[PDB]
Design a binder for this molecule. Sequence first.
Ligand SMILES: *C(=O)CCCC[C@@H]1SC[C@@H]2NC(=O)N[C@@H]21
Lengths: 591, 506
Amino acid sequence: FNKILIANRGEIACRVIKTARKMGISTVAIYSDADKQALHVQMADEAVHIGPPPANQSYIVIDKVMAAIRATGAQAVHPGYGFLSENSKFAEALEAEGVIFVGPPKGAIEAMGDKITSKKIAQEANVSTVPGVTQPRHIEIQVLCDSHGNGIYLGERECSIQRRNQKVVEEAPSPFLDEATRRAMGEQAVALAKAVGYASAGTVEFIVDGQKNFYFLEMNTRLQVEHPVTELITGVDLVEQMIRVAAGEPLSITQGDVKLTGWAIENRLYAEDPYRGFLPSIGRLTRYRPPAEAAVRNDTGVYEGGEISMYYDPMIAKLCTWAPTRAAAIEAMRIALDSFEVEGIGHNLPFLSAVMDHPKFISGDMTTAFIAEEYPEGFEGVNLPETDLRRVAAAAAAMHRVAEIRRTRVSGRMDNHERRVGTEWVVTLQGADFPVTIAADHDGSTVSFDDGSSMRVTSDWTPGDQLANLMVDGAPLVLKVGKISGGFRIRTRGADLKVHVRTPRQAELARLMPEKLPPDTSKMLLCPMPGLIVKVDVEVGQEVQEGQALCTIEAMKMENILRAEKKGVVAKINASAGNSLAVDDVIMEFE
Amino acid sequence: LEQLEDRRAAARLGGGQKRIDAQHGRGKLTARERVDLLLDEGSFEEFDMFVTHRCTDFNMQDQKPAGDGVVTGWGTINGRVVYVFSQDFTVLGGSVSETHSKKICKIMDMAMQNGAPVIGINDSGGARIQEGVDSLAGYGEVFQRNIMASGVVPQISMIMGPCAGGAVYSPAMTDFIFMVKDSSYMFVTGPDVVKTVTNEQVSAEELGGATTHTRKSSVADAAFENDVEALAEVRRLVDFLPLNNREKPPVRPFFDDPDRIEPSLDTLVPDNPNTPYDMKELIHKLADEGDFYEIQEEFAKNIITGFIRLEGRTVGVVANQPLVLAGCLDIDSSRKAARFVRFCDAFEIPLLTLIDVPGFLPGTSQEYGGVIKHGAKLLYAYGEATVPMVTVITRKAYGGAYVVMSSKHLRADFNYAWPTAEVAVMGAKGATEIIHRGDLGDPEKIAQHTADYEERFANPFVASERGFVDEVIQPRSTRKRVARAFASLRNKSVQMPWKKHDNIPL
Ligand SMILES: *C(=O)CCCC[C@@H]1SC[C@@H]2NC(=O)N[C@@H]21
């Protein structure tokens, strides 16, 4: 146990590194070019380049890796996942050195690597299988062995809620299957384990149905991205045990010991824009502010000031929470998200918030088509219910006054004739008006609405804070604030609306203001700068999101990215790399 | 007398309830309603409410409305005195007469005698033809006043309707011109004459609409969505401005720390020199509560001019935009920043200049267009300016442009530099081809000669050895460096040679 390299990067790299060094173990890492910044680099006690940004030239190249594994002296390399975590060539080259590839044996890996083979290996293994399903629920089991015959499972995680097959939300345990059927899946899971000679930790994916009838789709010989959930109820560090065993070792705990306490939910913060058909997002992270602690865990491979390059997975973070009861964890999460601040890229934060509030997620009655059933038209935005608009109205109204009073303390005002801040306002939310009166002293503020009702706003907030932690009617309300002519842009749950806080006459007149209609768009992308086309990243008949990078013209040794005006589909292109066009020259055409 | 109350209320009706609707019909508020939203709730005191014109030609004397087309007076904005006039389009088209101007002069003359800004709300059909030369003279006294007050008391012009003919020349001379997206416009000559003389057919909106002016002509400083935000944003603007050239920028509370660090900044300048970045990111992070009131945003986009506060005080800012024209300086970017700098100086507002310019924009269009003169304007502006001047070069600072951008030779106070700065006569390439002629036929000599010029001159250190850059700092600390830099200059006092006035190129 000492100098152990990592064949991966991103959040996972940190994930392992944070464990290695927590057990006094010489950490080491690798990194491409567009990754000298990366948080894992700086987390390790060493680091070695490995070539250009693409991994098919840096992170996958076994020569590169190896050269460094010795270059820094191995002892136990870890692949994290989705890279060489399951590529035999590298699995053998390590043994051809003595570098303990912490994980599964290159055999069992190729075993469950092929469907057919796997099918059989479970059969005699007496592993349930779709003979030859009602409410399909993707429910998996986390098992861990060692090369010493022992092996046990540590509960199950339900990842039913996934879009286009890409997992979105994982939870542990599963709100469906009970104790018996759980051990059922569990006992049979681990049994299947040994049957193939699995060493480290691995996952067995089942397809439970409406009657708790479970089957078996397959086994992934590696560490699962969604493992955090398992860890927050089992009280184990799969990355820890993973090395322990990969280092000839027994299991400190037996099946009778492995207890599963309270609940855990894990969301994935993806740099994708829900509002524009989850188009990936590329760019630098201006604000990047997650929560911290009912627990709150954030596995990230990014930081503020960092950039999300086209050369990797759009995941930015895994926001996990846990608590005693499930309802609890879903709550810490809901709060958790509310405070997660991200700026500079398009992300699914609002979308996640949305499903966390989705009844079916709340009732647990979810299938594997949930995402497809409930969000058939992509993410249509979220909109608050009266008692929500109400609470928000009051808060904005309360904050607005605060700010307004400050404008009043300008130097140079008429001595006995300063501006006096009003008490009556009209908060205009989601197409809803809220005539409200404010009275505030020192503790907080008391907002009263037309119906005689009154809420009490209390807050730390002050102009400029981008996030506002208020206390309206004793209950916590976390908002993301931005300035706007007549009030602010507020964002709560999947919410994101212009909250106007005006005075009665201000409001009365604004009502006379015409309703703005966006400009018109040509279906022709004209070249605005007489330059040279560096690159076109769009194909004919491709569909583009409003604001999507189309091409890139080089101006005066400066690159300019041109982008779609409104969502649409490429009719024809008529210019390519190396081309040099003047102004107005049509670059592309849209149907 | 309740008779008074009647007369009063009669006057308040303007051209009548039917026309008021017409006005509202165009999405336009009334003269009085605009005034009502501009000034601190109930703080408006009106003057000359019963003024009537003195015309006798063309039976003009049979139509003698009260107020004669414009609402004048004073009030406060956040408690600070401000003088105002709102043209009442519903009254004889808010057409300018001898008496309509007189009313405007009364409060202009009052603004100047008491040292308070003048907000002009233009919404007029133009001169009152029946008055003849008296309408011309009417304009004259406004113009004159407009001129005498230039740089003595802030003059914010708000266009919220038509503005045609001589009229345009007044807002022309004020310090700011804001327009309302679709309901406003302004041009010296009308679309119809443009036809009969150019045979060109164009609509008023095309000819001089909010858009045309906020991004093509260089005449307006911003086009607001509608009358209500227009008014709201103007007070916002006023909250930054000093009340006159005697006092210094106003001060107010600020919930932010002068020692705030933005580590994000340390990676704002991209590694690849051909990749832009948004200069505006920096501006917001440095700006106090991230608030940045931008001027002429939609024009000469290769340069940014705006206001921000620091430690609750007003600071003007001029910075290069890589995203457009590669941050080149050009006739328009020059004219755009040049005036901003001059207004800020004329009014004791400090300047923060953020730099990353490659040089000026090449072209026959530029040279024939007179960059020699326009280009100099900005140079002239910084050369003349004596308020406190802090500068931070983020990346590119080459040649002439380098000098123009508030260089130390223009006697700026602090000349900071990020390590990614590169100040030099010209790029390594071009530099090399001039310095090493007899070496071009050896593509390895010049390939190496460049590589050396690059490694030896493209940075901020040669300039540091010279004292031209007072210091090279860590990007994250800019907010901290700049804040106290200004703090320490609050007492700055510098004298320019005596003269009636300057002769800056036009
Ligand atoms: C590279 O493509 C050739 C160099 C182009 C020169 C650039 S264009 C604008 C900059 N200012 C200037 O005078 N030269 C720079």
